[PDB]
Structures are given as structure tokens and as C-alpha cells.
């Protein structure tokens, strides 16, 4: 026929005719995921009301705005009444999709947004939400998964740094699991949590990971080569500090350090002379810098650690 292709909100395309029937009308013919829908309309700019009928006798129908301005999808059970999902979109983008339970309630409502934020949220058979999931503007969320008895089971927080927290909880909704992610990629992870806030730990750096533990005061990380063993204590605050022992009685060869807060680093000595700089940078890496053989003076420049290897070597 003459007929015109006019783009709709919600990435759909209608068909008007360019004549007007004997009565003063235009058809209208559109494929909304790859279902014919149809319609008659008293206006000539693809607005009006199109309808089908899908195999399984679910029935559907578009409204479009005078304006084109918004679209309205509705599919219902066979009786036409009884609603089984809608789409209403936007020109700007911004659309609201409902799926309905056999109640006639919400089981999911996602909307996504101009400036591409969204929240999409799930709800059980209580009516209660199960899921919730929302993202921001800024691409930062936050991801909520509940139970059935209605208690947190997953969450994460994610920040527009990239920063983030997951964690995960057991079948009582008691934590058993948390993540923490840092801007830069490094992680700590805390695993094997008990009632009484211990647990496991470990600090994914960029090349190597540190093992430990945590306790209701803080988390120590530890590398031990023979009798020296180090330990980087990370505060509540998030405040380190670290600390050296050597077991070694042998005064010629016996470690000992002091840490410098101010400076975030430990210095080295072995039999009164400075050996080497640990230093433990707020860019979550540690550089290793020796001395000269008087103790005097660094030498050379600082080398960052990219193995866990290199701090055992440090500590021998």
C-alpha cells in the first residue's frame, strides 16, 4: 500500500496508511516481537491502538500516544482482562516492563531510565521483594538477593570508583562470606565467618596474595621465612601497621624493625646496621629499598613487590 514507516518509543516500528478510507480513517500495521499487530485509527501519524492474538491465545495491545510520544503493551490471558505483562515506554528512552502473577500482582517491575539508571526488582508469592537490583547513573549499584524466610541471603555494594563490598550469608542469614574490592583491583577476603567475628583472611594484591586471619580487633596478614616473620595489621580505622620477629638469638644475624606510621614504612636492621625500607604504599603495594653496607644511606631506588616470593627474600 502507500504507507508510511514511523519509529516508535520502545524500539518499535508502525505502518499508517497514507490514504484515509471512506470513512475518514488510516490502518495501522506493526511487528512487535515478531507478532502482526493491527488497528484502525482516526489520526494519520502512526498513533492509535493496534492489537493480535498470540498462539497461545494470549491476547495484546499497543496504545500509542497522540503525540508518539509513548507506547503501552499490554499482553493478557485469552479473556483479554487478565494482564500478563506491559511495556510502557518513552521518546526519551525511560520504560517500565511488569510481569503479573496469577494473583494479578507484581512479580517483577524493571525500569530503565533517560540517564540509563534502573531498578529492577523481583517480589515472591507473599508479595514481598525477593530481589532487588538497582543501578545508578554513574554505573555504581547495589544488588540485593533475599530468602524465603525474608532474610538477606547475597549483596553487593558497588561504588562509581569501582570500589565494592560482596558478601553472602548462610541458609540463617548469619554472614559467611565478604569481599571487600578497592578502587584499584586489590582485594581483601574474609571467609569462614563466625558468630563470634573471626574468620579466615586473605589481601589479593596486584601479582601475589597474603594469608591470614581476622579477629574483632583487625586483620593480620602474615609471611614467614624461617625464624623472621612478618605481620601487616590493618586497623578498623583501615589504619596498618606492621610489624617484624625474628627468632634468631644470633646477634650477628638477628632482625629487628621499626615501623614509621607517619612514613608507612619499616626499616630493617641486622647486627646495629639499616639492611632495607619496606614500604607500605596507600596504593596497596609494598617496594623493598636496601641500604649500604655502612647502614648510611638507601641505595638505588625502590623495586615494588610483584611476588611473594620477593617478601620472603626480604626477610631473609
Same mark, same amino acid.
Given at each position: 500500500?502507500?504507507?508510511?514507516?514511523?519509529?516508535?518509543?520502545?524500539?518499535?516500528?508502525?505502518?499508517?496508511?497514507?490514504?484515509?478510507?471512506?470513512?475518514?480513517?488510516?490502518?495501522?500495521?506493526?511487528?512487535?516481537?515478531?507478532?502482526?499487530?493491527?488497528?484502525?485509527?482516526?489520526?494519520?501519524?502512526?498513533?492509535?491502538?493496534?492489537?493480535?492474538?498470540?498462539?497461545?491465545?494470549?491476547?495484546?495491545?499497543?496504545?500509542?500516544?497522540?503525540?508518539?510520544?509513548?507506547?503501552?503493551?499490554?499482553?493478557?490471558?485469552?479473556?483479554?482482562?487478565?494482564?500478563?505483562?506491559?511495556?510502557?515506554?518513552?521518546?526519551?528512552?525511560?520504560?517500565?516492563?511488569?510481569?503479573?502473577?496469577?494473583?494479578?500482582?507484581?512479580? #517483577?517491575?524493571?525500569?530503565?531510565?533517560?540517564?540509563?539508571?534502573?531498578?529492577?526488582?523481583?517480589?515472591?508469592?507473599?508479595?514481598?521483594?525477593?530481589?532487588?537490583?538497582?543501578?545508578?547513573?554513574?554505573?555504581?549499584?547495589?544488588?540485593?538477593?533475599?530468602?524465603?524466610?525474608?532474610?538477606?541471603?547475597?549483596?553487593?555494594?558497588?561504588?562509581?570508583?569501582?570500589?565494592?563490598?560482596?558478601?553472602?550469608?548462610?541458609?540463617?542469614?548469619?554472614?559467611?562470606?565478604?569481599?571487600?574490592?578497592?578502587?584499584?583491583?586489590?582485594? #581483601?577476603?574474609?571467609?569462614?565467618?563466625?558468630?563470634?567475628?573471626?574468620?579466615?583472611?586473605?589481601?589479593?594484591?596486584?601479582?601475589?596474595?597474603?594469608?591470614?586471619?581476622?579477629?574483632?580487633?583487625?586483620?593480620?596478614?602474615?609471611?614467614?621465612?624461617?625464624?623472621?616473620?612478618?605481620?601487616?595489621?590493618?586497623?578498623?580505622?583501615?589504619?596498618?601497621?606492621?610489624?617484624?620477629?625474628?627468632?634468631?638469638?644470633?646477634?650477628?644475624?638477628?632482625?629487628?624493625?621499626?615501623?614509621?606510621?607517619?612514613?608507612?614504612?619499616?626499616?630493617?636492621?641486622?647486627?646495629?646496621?639499616?639492611?632495607?625500607?619496606?614500604?607500605?604504599?596507600?596504593?596497596?603495594?609494598?617496594?623493598?629499598?636496601?641500604?649500604?653496607?655502612?647502614?648510611?644511606?638507601?641505595?638505588?631506588?625502590?623495586?615494588?613487590?610483584?611476588?611473594?616470593?620477593?617478601?620472603?627474600?626480604? #626477610?631473609?
Amino acid at each position: 500500500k502507500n504507507s508510511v514507516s514511523v519509529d516508535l518509543p520502545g524500539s518499535m516500528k508502525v505502518l499508517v496508511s497514507k490514504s484515509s478510507n471512506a470513512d475518514g480513517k488510516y490502518d495501522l500495521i506493526a511487528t512487535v516481537d515478531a507478532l502482526e499487530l493491527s488497528g484502525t485509527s482516526d489520526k494519520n501519524n502512526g498513533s492509535g491502538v493496534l492489537e493480535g492474538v498470540k498462539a497461545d491465545a494470549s491476547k495484546v495491545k499497543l496504545t500509542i500516544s497522540d503525540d508518539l510520544g509513548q507506547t503501552t503493551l499490554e499482553v493478557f490471558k485469552s479473556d483479554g482482562s487478565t494482564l500478563v505483562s506491559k511495556k510502557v515506554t518513552s521518546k526519551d528512552k525511560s520504560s517500565t516492563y511488569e510481569l503479573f502473577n496469577e494473583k494479578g500482582e507484581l512479580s #517483577l517491575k524493571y525500569i530503565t531510565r533517560a540517564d540509563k539508571s534502573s531498578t529492577y526488582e523481583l517480589f515472591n508469592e507473599k508479595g514481598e521483594l525477593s530481589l532487588k537490583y538497582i543501578t545508578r547513573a554513574d554505573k555504581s549499584s547495589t544488588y540485593e538477593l533475599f530468602n524465603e524466610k525474608g532474610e538477606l541471603s547475597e549483596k553487593k555494594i558497588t561504588r562509581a570508583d569501582k570500589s565494592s563490598t560482596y558478601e553472602l550469608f548462610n541458609e540463617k542469614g548469619e554472614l559467611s562470606l565478604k569481599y571487600i574490592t578497592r578502587a584499584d583491583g586489590t582485594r #581483601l577476603e574474609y571467609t569462614g565467618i563466625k558468630s563470634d567475628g573471626s574468620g579466615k583472611a586473605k589481601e589479593v594484591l596486584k601479582g601475589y596474595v597474603l594469608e591470614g586471619t581476622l579477629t574483632a580487633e583487625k586483620t593480620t596478614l602474615v609471611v614467614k621465612e624461617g625464624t623472621v616473620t612478618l605481620s601487616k595489621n590493618i586497623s578498623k580505622s583501615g589504619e596498618v601497621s606492621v610489624e617484624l620477629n625474628d627468632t634468631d638469638s644470633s646477634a650477628a644475624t638477628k632482625k629487628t624493625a621499626a615501623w614509621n606510621s607517619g612514613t608507612s614504612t619499616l626499616t630493617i636492621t641486622v647486627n646495629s646496621k639499616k639492611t632495607k625500607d619496606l614500604v607500605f604504599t596507600s596504593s596497596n603495594t609494598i617496594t623493598v629499598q636496601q641500604y649500604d653496607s655502612n647502614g648510611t644511606s638507601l641505595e638505588g631506588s625502590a623495586v615494588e613487590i610483584t611476588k611473594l616470593d620477593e617478601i620472603k627474600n626480604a #626477610l631473609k
